[PDB]
Write an enzyme that holds these catalytic residues in place. Structure first.
Site: not given
Ligand SMILES: O=c1cc(O)n([C@@H]2O[C@H](COP(=O)(O)O)[C@@H](O)[C@H]2O)c(=O)[nH]1
Ligand SMILES: O=c1cc(O)n([C@@H]2O[C@H](COP(=O)(O)O)[C@@H](O)[C@H]2O)c(=O)[nH]1
Lengths: 218, 219
Positions: A64, A66
């Site tokens: 993820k 980010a």
């Protein structure tokens, strides 16, 4: 990407012995494993090479991603050095952050998956309202692989509409989170399944059962 | 709030254990708080936290920008605190349940959560900026006490400080390599995060000392 039985195992056990054993138990049913931070932060990045050695499965690193572009580039390099075939990246931080990941993936012969909308209730607060625009951003950037939520098939269908039938779409949330495998596969190419396999009394039977239920879709 | 020496946090984003240890050792007289992120952790393992504690005794903020569903967030926090991190940085954009999951683990384990509101890079303007005030307000509602906001947008950093109040702790990246100004940033942030302009310097200790000299009236 050709995913066996349209089923990706989310291996979120945090113990090497259990993770290897359970994956071995279901290996006849899959050829793709999603490895995330629960396992990696517990057992190290070397776990990826070990999965490849033992199972010869493809590995999607669900990290993820980010961060800012500079840091995203470093994360992707470290991840691909460890042998991941693909990495999952958040779209919410914007286009430059996604492009940073695409660049490293191209350099190392790997794939980026763009996470648009998430499956948990909190996704409704900020992510959901940005998700269509994130998907269009993916299209603009030439992203070919996407992640969207099993638990909201109307949102998953919209995501499929935006990206087209040619893009590749995988979807978590079936089983434990309440999504239905068959309905999800109306729109996604493959489903991601974690707890309803790896926490099942009999993981192999659990995997076989899911596949039996979607047999006409294979 | 954590007492950050010289209001300066090193972002140790070198990817080689030998270099990361050398540079951190060199600046230790100036900095007692180190932010360790995924570039170093994914290269050298979670035991790098153990090594830093052993060698330097610095506080460790794990910059993992936690951004998953509540179930997975809990596991990430548990693994991170088990390794010895004092604190973890969590994204707010995935919503309140995801943040609460991290807070619950931090409470159980006696550690701290930092909530990342707005980010410093240009892409932050696309989606994050428009949600940031609400993310910060959500943090306040959830009882979050520690926050991260961007050095490069003083106007946004000021608003964030207003939302969270003077009692909350606020750290800020973007000074140096990304163009932010240390002094201006410290009008609003308790501490600045600085990476490349220290760790890529010919003399990282001199680079840190120079930054500190420039903000000496603010210490
Ligand atoms: O929106 C999303 C995106 C994810 O990657 N995931 C991931 O997919 C997996 C879902 O596992 P499970 O089948 O046990 O609910 C977890 O690894 C989780 O982090 C998710 O649940 N929702
Ligand atoms: O909005 C943010 C949030 C961050 O954590 N960071 C982090 O802060 C550090 C900035 O380092 P630098 O001083 O080299 O620009 C990096 O570790 C980066 O991942 C950032 O730059 N912007």
């Amino acid at each position: 990407m050709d995913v066996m039985n349209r089923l990706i195992l989310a291996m979120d056990l945090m113990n090497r012995d259990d993770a290897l054993r359970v994956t071995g138990e279901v290996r006849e049913y899959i050829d793709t494993v999603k490895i995330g931070y629960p396992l990696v932060l517990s057992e190290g990045m070397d776990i990826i090479a070990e999965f490849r050695k033992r199972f010869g499965c493809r590995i999607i690193a669900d990290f993820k991603v980010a961060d800012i572009p500079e840091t995203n580039e470093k994360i992707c390099r470290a991840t691909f050095k460890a042998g991941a075939d693909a990495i999952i990246v958040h779209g919410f931080p914007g286009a430059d952050s996604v492009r940073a990941c695409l660049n490293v993936a191209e350099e190392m012969g790997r794939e980026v998956f763009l996470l648009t909308e998430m499956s948990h209730p909190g996704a409704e607060m900020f992510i959901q309202g940005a998700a269509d625009e994130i998907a269009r951003m993916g299209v603009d950037l030439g992203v070919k692989n996407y992640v969207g939520p099993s638990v909201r098939p109307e949102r998953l269908s919209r995501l499929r509409e935006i990206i087209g039938q040619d893009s590749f779409l995988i979807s978590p949330g079936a089983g434990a989170q309440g999504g239905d495998p068959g309905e999800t596969l109306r729109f996604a190419d493959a489903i991601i399944v974690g707890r309803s396999i790896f926490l099942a009394d009999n993981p192999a039977a659990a995997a076989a059962g899911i596949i039996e239920s979607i047999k006409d879709l294979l």
